Amino acid sequence: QGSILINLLLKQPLIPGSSLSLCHLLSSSSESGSFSLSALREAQNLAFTGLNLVARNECSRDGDPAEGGRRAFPLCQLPGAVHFLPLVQFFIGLHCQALQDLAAAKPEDSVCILEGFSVTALSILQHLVCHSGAVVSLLLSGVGGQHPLLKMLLHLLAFSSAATGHLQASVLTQCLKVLVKLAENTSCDFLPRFQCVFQVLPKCLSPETPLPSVLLAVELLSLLADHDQLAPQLCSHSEGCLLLLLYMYITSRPDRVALETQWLQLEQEVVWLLAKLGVQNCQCNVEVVRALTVMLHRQWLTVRRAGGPPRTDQQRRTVRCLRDTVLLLHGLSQKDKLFMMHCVEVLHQFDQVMPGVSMLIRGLPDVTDCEEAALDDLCA
């Protein structure tokens, strides 16, 4: 009896600034071939039918815990959500061909209005898919194999892959959040469906691309990693490693006027992904050792400066990131012995980082041997 999705969808406009949010979608007027205007109106009417339909059904999201575990979330199948989705289909489909035309030239205003509205629709879609697993599975099923709105959203992803203007960069970060929600919702068999997103992803994580997009992209890559076939699909085997670009972004961060918090969380997400990867010749393997040395150094420096418990969530964050990074590194040493050779480049700073890290580690109560032993491997 949650209806969290319904409250999210119909409420104050989710988008800061522009007030275009599902609510308006439903009330959106016609003035403001295949994508007929009447079909637009009908997509609105469909999301409204779903509004009036969701509450009606009664359901248990997960029949058993294992099944709900696989998805990582229980969803009660609300027919309303599936009806909602056609509205997103129309608004996302809009302005895609218009963007294509804008680019082919060498008409924009329509593309812009439609794109703002479409980011609204993307957030709305996140919510709607999040609540009902049926609306998701519908998009998810394929011949070999994507939903039609899924193909239009792939177009949108191509726009993400493409060089991102300011507004397009924010839109792209939105798309990446959509994608992480997409993944988590997707079923294991639907991960092969997600395989197509990989080709878009390398452009998605780029020095030009904004930070929040990269945080969400690391999350999406992590979601993809669980699939056995997807996991190898990461580095290009000497062809530029794809992971290689993410860790490079973290090592040196384009878009330097950005929230430090989100930087930190992106890095922590890559840490989590590295762990999950561990559970499941390259230039990149040498390259990865550099970003992590830099990050552990940042954290250690922060600790040295700081005194007493971490009031700031940021400081507690480092304490935790430092321990996790030390753990990943201990492996960045047990994993490869050649690892240390390519690490020597940053080893000057890393060696200094290490000892005070050992100190703080031994200090923290959350710290453990499995955590301090990791550190002992790096510094000796």
Partner 1 sequence: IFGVLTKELLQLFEDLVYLHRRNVMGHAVEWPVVMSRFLSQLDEHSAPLQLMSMQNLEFIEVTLLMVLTRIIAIVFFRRQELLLWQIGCVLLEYGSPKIKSLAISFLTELFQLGGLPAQPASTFFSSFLELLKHLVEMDTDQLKLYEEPLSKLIKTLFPFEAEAYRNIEPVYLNMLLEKLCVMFEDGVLMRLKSDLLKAALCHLLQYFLKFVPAGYESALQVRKVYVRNICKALLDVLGIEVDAEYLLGPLYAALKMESMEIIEEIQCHVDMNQKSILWSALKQKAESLQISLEYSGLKNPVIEMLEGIAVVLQLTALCTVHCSHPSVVITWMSLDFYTKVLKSCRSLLESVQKLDLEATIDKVVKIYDALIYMQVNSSFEDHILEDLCGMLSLPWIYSHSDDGCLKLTTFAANLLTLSCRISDSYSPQAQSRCVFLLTLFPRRIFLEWRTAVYNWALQSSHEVIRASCVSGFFILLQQQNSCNRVPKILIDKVKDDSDIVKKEFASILGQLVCTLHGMFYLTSSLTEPFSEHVKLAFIDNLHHLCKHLDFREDETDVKAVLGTLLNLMEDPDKDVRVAFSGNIKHILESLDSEDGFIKELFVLRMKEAYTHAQISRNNELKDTLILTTGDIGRAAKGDLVPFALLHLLHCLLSKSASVSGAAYTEIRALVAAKSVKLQSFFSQYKKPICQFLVESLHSSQMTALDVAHQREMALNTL
Which parts of this chain interact with its own copies (CB under 8 A)? 1, 3, 6-7, 10-13, 19, 21-29, 45, 48-49, 51-52, 55-57
Question: Among residues 10, 273, 294, 360, which is the contact residue for partner 1, using CB under 8 A?
Answer: 273
CA 89 – CA 87 distance, rounded (Å): 5
238 binds, options its own copies, partner 1, Zn ion, none, Cβ within 5 to 8 A by partner type: none
Determine, following the binding rule CB under 5 A, whether residue 332 of this chain makes contact with Zn ion: no
Determine, following the binding rule CB under 5 A, whether residue 241 of this chain makes contact with Zn ion: yes
- 175 contacts: CB under 8 Å, gap ≥ 6: 122, 153, 156, 157, 160, 213
**Residue with Cβ nearer its own copies (57 or 280):** 57
261 binds, options Zn ion, its own copies, partner 1, none, Cβ within 5 to 8 A by partner type: partner 1
CA torsion 103-108-110-111 (nearest 10°) is: 40
Determine, following the binding rule CB under 8 A, whether residue 65 of this chain makes contact with partner 1: yes
Residue type at 293? T
| Region from 141-149, 190-198, 231-239, 272-280 binding partner 1, contact rule CB under 8 A | 272-280
**CA quadruple 140, 142, 148, 151: dihedral positive or negative?**
positive
**Residue with Cβ nearer Zn ion (113 or 282):** 282
Determine, following the binding rule CB under 5 A, whether residue 284 of this chain makes contact with Zn ion: yes
Quick one: residue 150, left, alpha or beta (phi over 0 = left, psi -120 to 50 = alpha)? alpha
For 116, the token pair is 């703002």
CA 347 – CA 333 distance, rounded (Å): 12
CA 279 – CA 176 distance, rounded (Å): 25
Determine, following the binding rule CB under 5 A, whether residue 134 of this chain makes contact with Zn ion: no
241 binds, options partner 1, its own copies, Zn ion, none, Cβ within 5 to 8 A by partner type: Zn ion
First to last CA, the chain: 57
Determine, following the binding rule CB under 5 A, whether residue 225 of this chain makes contact with Zn ion: no
CA 347 – CA 342 distance, rounded (Å): 9
What is the smallest separation between the CB atom of 109 and its own copies, expressed in angstroms? 18
Determine, following the binding rule CB under 8 A, whether residue 141 of this chain makes contact with partner 1: no
**CA quadruple 224, 225, 231, 234: dihedral positive or negative?**
positive
- 174 contacts: CB under 8 Å, gap ≥ 6: 119, 122, 123
Given the rule CB under 8 A, which residues bind partner 1?
2, 4, 7-8, 11, 45-46, 49, 52, 56, 64-66, 68-69, 72-74, 130-131, 183-184, 218-219, 222-223, 225-226, 261, 265, 268-269, 272-273, 275-276, 278-280, 304, 307, 311-313, 316, 320, 323-324, 327, 348-349, 351-352, 355-356, 368, 370-371
Given the rule CB under 5 A, which residues bind Zn ion?
235, 241, 282, 284
